[PDB]
RNA sequence: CACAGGGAUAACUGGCUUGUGGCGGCCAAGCGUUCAUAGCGACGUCGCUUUUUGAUCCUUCGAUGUCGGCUCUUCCUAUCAUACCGAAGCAGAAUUCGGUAAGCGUUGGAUUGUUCACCCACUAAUAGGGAACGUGAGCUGGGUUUAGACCGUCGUGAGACAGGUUAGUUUUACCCUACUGAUGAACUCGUCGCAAUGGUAAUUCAGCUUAGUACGAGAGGAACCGCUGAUUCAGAUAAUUGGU
RNA sequence: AGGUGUCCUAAGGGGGGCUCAUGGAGAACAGAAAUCUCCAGUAGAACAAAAGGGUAAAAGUCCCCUUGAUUUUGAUUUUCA
RNA sequence: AGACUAAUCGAACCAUCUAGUAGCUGGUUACCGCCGAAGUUUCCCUCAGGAUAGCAGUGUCGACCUUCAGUUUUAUGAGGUAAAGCGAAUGAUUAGGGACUCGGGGGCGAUUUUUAGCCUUCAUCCAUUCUCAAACUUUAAAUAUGUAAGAAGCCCUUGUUACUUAACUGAACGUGGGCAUUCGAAUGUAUCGACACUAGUGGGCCAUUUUUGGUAAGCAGAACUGGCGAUGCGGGAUGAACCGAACGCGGGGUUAAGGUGCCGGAGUGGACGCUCAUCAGACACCACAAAAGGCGUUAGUACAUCUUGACAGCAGGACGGUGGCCAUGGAAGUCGGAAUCCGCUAAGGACUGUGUAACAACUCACCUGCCGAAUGUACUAGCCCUGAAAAUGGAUGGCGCUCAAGC
């Protein structure tokens, strides 16, 4: 099986997720989404790069794992197993059907032709839009060249057109590099597991002080 | 393919969010007379005297009054001609309509405003007119100096 | 063999060909469907009011 | 096309909560004042929350060149749309007026980059006051000291209706 | 077996589509003693073709003769051989990858109705396809597909079977055009010449010599010129030999 | 993606008291799970059946009395000429 | 042998009933004038056919009724699609952190263990985090949609009744009276209402936006509107459906879509650029081409170097401690193992190679002399080129065109 990817490139049907109405869908191909030192603190990795889509198309589950493996090998070899954190931010939830013309309607004739042509599940695919982020990598500042090359190498496994953008934020946080740096000096940022939480001055005064001791001087 | 009496009414007849429960009791204290203008709005909780899904949202005229229901006349559009329809609706579904209140307000106002002028002796120009184009005026720039704008260069957000 | 199932392509133009005719409203609507109890009494009421107004020439002078 | 510069001033319609709203002014290059107003509402819709239905135009004027008989260098900042993405450039021109540079720029971008009028935004036009602030090398050669050059191989002009000449022409005009 | 009709509806060509079939690219984890790219290429991904088979039912049911072989002409290149060259994990010899190139060739037999296939032998080589799946008023009629007859399984029976077996009529050109040849009115009848345009042709191998030389530890083992013959094809000829 | 050719003297009609699924903490045999007590608990339970809507001093649950599942004919709504 | 029974046999020949019936093929005879369709709804042993409603014509009557409307404006109702949401319910889903031990699993101090000891791996709970939903939702458009805009209106006074109220209190229908000086939004009214009888049609097809099954189709099935069928004319060379525009017989004037080097009516017309192809390119529907590449050329983004003078070439030099610590028939920078300082300077390394048994010699690195203004690396997108293979001879319509007659 495994028809060429040219046959399922355009979003032409309403979303068809697996539910209690369709049963027997095959298990998707990609499982792991986070690789590398996925528990480093926010202060360790201040540089982020993205792989941004530029078409309204469909990305197969098989292609997503192929790009994940390709980028992982290059990063591990040149940056070290502990020098990066890679995250895949596209999840396939759309199920594509197939009409087995000869398996179902061959040999023993049964009914042949286009009569009763509703198909059976065949795979899982992901829907993307223009400007949607596909793969993100965070690392040190001295690894800018390595990160760019790794992303540029893994786009040959995708159909369509993709771009590479160096983000202006700090790590995976939605804050500008300058803004996060000065806010942290004010004591309104507390450490968590690989992420942070922020002071919100809209609760009871008691535990806001212990959670953020440096906010009040 | 089926065609039942309530088919396709999953969202139409349902009560809203945080609005289930007790019916506000002022509904049963209203009064109706023949010739009034009422509009239909089906309440899901009451299952008796409920009209067909076509009339949910139409406006009609009362023509009969009984112990707990009113008769409404509405006009239905079959292909190429109109037909008069007469339905019986329980009062939990009907409601007085503000469609005609603007007219009834204006006739009372017109009669009194015309009366004073006839005693005084000046034309009124009572009937309404649509919006007219604006008139000439002057705008001063004292302490309101204009600020110059320009398009902004392209920049990447993410 | 097989043929077209259903259509509505030219129905709107056919209906508007010579107008969508709305029945004319008129001063005195019929009393069909009104509850009988009010209908019986209304009959007796009108019988009296005609006689009283007929006697207006040789009578009450209200 | 054939352009000329305007200034146009707009305003949000005054209301009881906000009498005397603010005033905004732009410089717009347009063939005529009918499309000069149209571009004002287009640029303003991307900066403030004002439409044409809820606004009004205060004044529109024509700005003319101060010294249309002096040669000077110009620099233009602009953005445009390609077939994929948007970009920023900065080009230079040499002429006598502000209006013609926008005319020259529109024809230049249409040829070298296939960019139409629909997808070009003009950011700023400034006249270069000095001579050492000229960047591009195709204008540096036009400001060299004691410029002079001949014109070799120039075809003479012959009436298009006079066929069958009687002798060979010459190209040493 | 019959009648009234249907290209509103199937079995063959042609048309749109290319899933399957066939053919060709891009990226580079790894194989190759060492070394991603001499020669290959996983996981993925972009195309071309209409000699496979499907899907569709637009044209023909007052009829377009429906398998295969024999015969004969021409065209396509995704090149089996031949001409001349570029690469190598190319010392020689033998091989493998690629370019310009369709000028010229691509066979004789055993079994099967076969297309397809499989062995014997020769050869420089025994490449793949199109033309209404070229070609029945060109042939042949072994196969399939009318009526006779036999067997096996199925059916109570008449009978059924893309299961096996044996026997079974193949019609017409003198018309128009096309092609191959042959005469010919008008400007007197003749002899001797020029050449616009159309056609075009040759092909491959072996022996002797170079030489048991270059090259190689050895085993092994070439080529250019020169000389003489032969295979397939083409145009003539009859002194001799053979046939009538 | 699924359903119907049935089932009910109450699973029909009226009235009255009560509050469900589940969770926390406790009590001889007693345990993950038997019965008893308190606190929290917007329906996450139940209502003959497919699915959707609706219901909390009820339309759920238990108790008390009953046969409007009766008689005579007309008007109206949905599929629709 | 379904064989033969007068050229006739799976039921002979001759006359009559008989002009046997046909929802199925074929044909159906002069001219001009005016109006002008349907392939859709419901039922039928109905699907090649009929009845029923619609669309169509003719004959009129009621008034010339001032009534009307595929429309806008103002006031007021209904809805659950596009988008949006998941640190909001139901369903799906990725990752760390904190809190807990008696939830399961594996250990440790004597596996002592009823040690809430010391370890920890899942599970659980709490505050955060990465992506989704035709048959999920707290929210919520655009386009379309119901009603109203008065004389049959508004207000005052008071008769009838077997209904209704404790009650002449209400309820419907009324007599009498009051309110125009202006009958109470725009625009149009080249078309008002009612009735009678009947023809053809009930195979449809194409396109923009929305949209379902299918790998896809000049394939199958739908919604609103415009077209062909039923229709010529001017442009797309040709072509039922595309663009312009709908038609009595003529004369003059002006244009639309499309065109102006020749065929061909009208420019080898004007301004600034880009492109050289041994397969150039040349106008919507439309008759095709992709990923990936180029130091061909043009324009652009960012960083770094430079008059204290770089980039290229040529030309000068290329020094000490020290043959460093180790290794050793022998290793002096250069088998190998492990460190990387200092002198002198403008610059020359406890050295990148070549090379010696081992030294040497030589190269590079680094700096200096000459010159005269720019130079280096990585990316973006225009035209062009590679990727680019089919069968009779051949088609931007043809000829031909290169500061075009190409974009
Ligand atoms: Mg394939
Ligand atoms: Mg679909
Ligand atoms: Mg429905
Ligand atoms: Mg509702
Ligand atoms: Mg009921
Ligand atoms: Mg039909
Ligand atoms: Mg029509
Ligand atoms: Mg057909
Ligand atoms: Mg294919
Ligand atoms: Mg290897
Ligand atoms: Mg290769
Ligand atoms: Mg592969
Ligand atoms: Mg085919
Ligand atoms: Mg066919
Ligand atoms: Mg036929
Ligand atoms: Mg024929
Ligand atoms: Mg024939
Ligand atoms: Mg043969
Ligand atoms: Mg070739
Ligand atoms: Mg070759
Ligand atoms: Mg040949
Ligand atoms: Mg033979
Ligand atoms: Mg073929
Ligand atoms: Mg054939
Ligand atoms: Mg024959
Ligand atoms: Mg044949
Ligand atoms: Mg023949
Ligand atoms: Mg035979
Ligand atoms: Mg037979
Ligand atoms: Mg016979
Ligand atoms: Mg038997
Ligand atoms: Mg047989
Ligand atoms: Mg036979
Ligand atoms: Mg015989
Ligand atoms: Mg003959
Ligand atoms: Mg030798
Ligand atoms: Mg030998
Ligand atoms: Mg040889
Ligand atoms: Mg011969
Ligand atoms: Mg002889
Ligand atoms: Mg079903
Ligand atoms: Mg009961
Ligand atoms: Mg009860
Ligand atoms: Mg109760
Ligand atoms: Mg519910
Ligand atoms: Mg229906
Ligand atoms: Mg027989
Ligand atoms: Mg006889
Ligand atoms: Mg006989
Ligand atoms: Mg007989
Ligand atoms: Mg007879
Ligand atoms: Mg007859
Ligand atoms: Mg007859
Ligand atoms: Mg006519
Ligand atoms: Mg007409
Ligand atoms: Mg049929
Ligand atoms: Mg027919
Ligand atoms: Mg008519
Ligand atoms: Mg919704
Ligand atoms: Mg809905
Ligand atoms: Mg959505
Ligand atoms: Mg929302
Ligand atoms: Mg959720
Ligand atoms: Mg959840
Ligand atoms: Mg956790
Ligand atoms: Mg929805
Ligand atoms: Mg409205
Ligand atoms: Mg029918
Ligand atoms: Mg009919
Ligand atoms: Mg048809
Ligand atoms: Mg018919
Ligand atoms: Mg067509
Ligand atoms: Mg169709
Ligand atoms: Mg069809
Ligand atoms: Mg027309
Ligand atoms: Mg024409
Ligand atoms: Mg054309
Ligand atoms: Mg022109
Ligand atoms: Mg001309
Ligand atoms: Mg010119
Ligand atoms: Mg060249
Ligand atoms: Mg380029
Ligand atoms: Mg440049
Ligand atoms: Mg130098
Ligand atoms: Mg090309
Ligand atoms: Mg040509
Ligand atoms: Mg061409
Ligand atoms: Mg042309
Ligand atoms: Mg020019
Ligand atoms: Mg031309
Ligand atoms: Mg031009």
UniProtKB/TrEMBL annotation, chain A:
Annotated residues for binding of Mg(2+): 13
Family matches, as InterPro entries: Ribosomal_uL16, Ribosomal_uL16_CS_euk_arc, Ribosomal_uL16_dom, Ribosomal_uL16_euk_arch, Ribosomal_uL16_sf
A Gene Ontology biological process term: translation
Keyword field: Metal-binding, Ribonucleoprotein, Ribosomal protein
Molecular function in Gene Ontology: structural constituent of ribosome
Pfam families found in the cross-reference section: Ribosomal_L16
GO CC entries: ribonucleoprotein complex; ribosome
Family in the record: Belongs to the universal ribosomal protein uL16 family.
PANTHER family found in the cross-reference section: 60S RIBOSOMAL PROTEIN L10 (PTHR11726)
Protein's name according to its UniProt entry: 60S ribosomal protein L10-like protein
Annotated organism of origin: Chaetomium thermophilum (strain DSM 1495 / CBS 144.50 / IMI 039719)
From TrEMBL, chain B:
Keywords recorded for this protein, A-Z: Ribonucleoprotein, Ribosomal protein
Alphabetical list of Pfam families matching this protein: Ribosomal_L21e
Keyword flag Cytoplasm: no
GO molecular function: structural constituent of ribosome
Matching Gene3D superfamilies: 6.10.250.3260, Ribosomal protein L21 (2.30.30.70)
A GO term from the CC aspect: ribonucleoprotein complex
Example GO BP: translation
Family membership noted in the UniProt record: Belongs to the eukaryotic ribosomal protein eL21 family.
Descriptive protein name: 60S ribosomal protein l21-like protein
From TrEMBL, chain C:
InterPro entries: Ribosomal_eL29 (IPR002673)
Stretch list, region Disordered: 1-46
Example GO BP: cytoplasmic translation
Residue ranges with Polar residues bias: 1-10
Pfam families hit by this protein: Ribosomal_L29e
Keywords annotated in UniProt: Ribonucleoprotein, Ribosomal protein
Amino acid composition bias (Basic residues), ranges on this chain: 11-25
Record bears the keyword DNA-binding: no
Record flagged with keyword Iron: no
Protein name in the entry: 60S ribosomal protein L29
Species, as recorded: Chaetomium globosum (strain ATCC 6205 / CBS 148.51 / DSM 1962 / NBRC 6347 / NRRL 1970)
Automatic annotation (TrEMBL), chain D:
Superkingdom per UniProt: Eukaryota
Record-level GO BP terms: translation
Pfam family, one: Ribosomal_L18A
SUPFAM superfamilies, A to Z: RplX-like
Keywords, sorted A to Z: Ribonucleoprotein, Ribosomal protein
Keyword Ribonucleoprotein: yes
Keyword DNA-binding recorded: no
A GO CC term assigned to this protein in UniProt: ribonucleoprotein complex
Gene Ontology MF term list: structural constituent of ribosome
Domain Large ribosomal subunit protein eL20: 3-125
HAMAP family hit by this protein: Ribosomal_eL20
Family, similarity comment: Belongs to the eukaryotic ribosomal protein eL20 family.
Protein's name in the database: 60S ribosomal protein L20
Organism per entry: Chaetomium thermophilum (strain DSM 1495 / CBS 144.50 / IMI 039719)
């Amino acid at each position: 099986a495994r028809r060429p990817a040219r046959c399922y490139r355009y979003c032409k049907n309403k979303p068809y997720p697996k539910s209690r109405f369709n049963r027997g869908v095959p298990d998707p191909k990609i499982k792991i989404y986070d690789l590398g030192r996925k528990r480093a603190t926010v202060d360790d990795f201040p540089l982020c790069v993205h792989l941004v889509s530029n078409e309204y198309e469909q990305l197969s589950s098989e292609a997503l794992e192929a790009a994940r493996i390709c980028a992982n090998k290059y990063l591990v070899k040149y940056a070290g197993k502990e020098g990066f954190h890679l995250r895949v931010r596209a999840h396939p939830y759309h199920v594509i059907r197939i009409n087995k013309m000869l398996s179902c309607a061959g040999a023993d004739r049964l009914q042949t032709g286009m009569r009763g042509a509703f198909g059976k599940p065949q795979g899982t695919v992901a829907r993307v839009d223009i400007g949607q982020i596909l793969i993100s990598v965070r690392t040190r500042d001295s690894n800018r060249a390595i990160a760019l090359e790794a992303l540029r190498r893994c786009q040959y496994k995708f159909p369509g057109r993709q771009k590479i953008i160096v983000s202006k934020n700090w790590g995976f946080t939605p804050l500008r590099r300058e803004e996060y740096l000065e806010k942290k000096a004010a004591g309104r940022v507390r450490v968590d597991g690989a992420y942070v939480q922020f002071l919100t001055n809209h609760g009871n005064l008691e535990e806001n002080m212990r959670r953020f001791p440096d906010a009040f001087k | 393919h089926a065609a039942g009496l309530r088919s396709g009414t999953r969202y139409a007849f349902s009560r809203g969010f945080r609005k289930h429960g007790q019916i506000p009791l002022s509904t049963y204290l209203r009064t109706y007379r023949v010739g009034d203008i009422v509009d239909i709005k089906v309440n899901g909780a009451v299952q008796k005297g409920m009209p067909h899904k076509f009339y949910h949202g139409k406006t009609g005229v009362v023509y009969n009054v009984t112990k707990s229901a009113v008769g409404v006349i509405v006009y239905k559009r079959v292909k190429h001609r109109y037909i008069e329809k007469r339905i019986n609706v329980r009062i939990e579904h009907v409601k007085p309509s503000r469609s005609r209140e603007d007219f009834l307000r204006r006739v009372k106002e017109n009669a009194e405003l015309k009366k004073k002028a006839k005693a005084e002796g000046v034309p009124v120009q009572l009937k309404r007119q649509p919006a007219m184009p604006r008139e000439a005026h002057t705008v001063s720039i004292a302490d309101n100096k204009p600020v110059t704008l320009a398009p902004v260069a392209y920049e990447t957000t993410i | 063999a097989k043929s077209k199932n259903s259509s509505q392509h030219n129905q709107s133009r056919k209906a508007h060909r010579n107008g969508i005719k709305k029945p004319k409203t008129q001063r005195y609507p019929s009393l069909k469907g009104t509850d009988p109890k009010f209908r019986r009494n209304h009959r007796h009421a009108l019988h009296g009011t005609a006689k009283a107004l007929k006697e207006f020439k040789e009578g009450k002078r209200e | 096309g054939r352009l000329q510069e305007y200034q146009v001033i707009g305003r949000h319609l005054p209301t009881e909560a906000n009498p005397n709203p603010a005033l905004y002014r732009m410089r717009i290059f347009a063939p005529n004042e009918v499309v000069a107003k149209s571009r004002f509402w287009y640029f303003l819709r991307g900066l403030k929350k004002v439409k044409k239905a809820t606004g009004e135009i205060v004044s529109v004027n024509v700005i003319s060149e101060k010294h249309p008989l002096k040669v000077k260098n110009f620099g233009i900042w602009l953005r445009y749309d390609s077939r994929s993405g948007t970009h920023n450039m900065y080009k230079e021109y040499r002429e006598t007026s502000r209006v013609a540079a926008v005319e020259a720029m529109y024809a230049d971008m249409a040829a070298r980059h296939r960019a139409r009028f629909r997808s070009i935004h003009i950011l700023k036009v400034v006249e270069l006051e000095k001579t050492e602030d000229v960047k591009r090398p195709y204008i540096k050669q036009l400001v060299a000291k004691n410029l002079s050059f001949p014109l070799p191989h120039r075809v003479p002009k012959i009436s298009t209706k006079k066929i069958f000449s009687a002798k060979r022409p010459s190209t040493f005009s």
